[PDB]
Amino acid sequence: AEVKLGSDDGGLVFSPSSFTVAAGEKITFKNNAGFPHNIVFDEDEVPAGVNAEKISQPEYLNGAGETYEVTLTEKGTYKFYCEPHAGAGMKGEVTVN
Ligand SMILES: [Cu+2]
């Protein structure tokens, strides 16, 4: 799967926003035009077993085109979002199955 942070003209949003995947799918968050971006997993809505720090990447990133891979493998739902661009409504969700 490929997620572009920052639409080409829609503004700052997780593109796609929410999407289901298979346990073993590679999810790459690629910066498109809204850096620096940040992705953190709401440890308040993450499965009671999958750490939210191993997938999250608090390490800010102002690189153009830079990306971060993530491969979840536990049928469920993980709620993530951008804390800095949260003022715009940048959120993320993945339903593994
Ligand atoms: Cu962001």
Swiss-Prot record:
Entries under Gene3D superfamilies matching the protein: Cupredoxins - blue copper proteins
Keyword Nucleotide-binding attributed: no
One GO MF term: copper ion binding
Highest taxon of source: Eukaryota
Metal-binding listed as a keyword: yes
Family statement: Belongs to the plastocyanin family.
PANTHER family: PLASTOCYANIN MAJOR ISOFORM, CHLOROPLASTIC-RELATED
Protein name in UniProt: Plastocyanin A/B
Organism (species): Petroselinum crispum (Parsley)
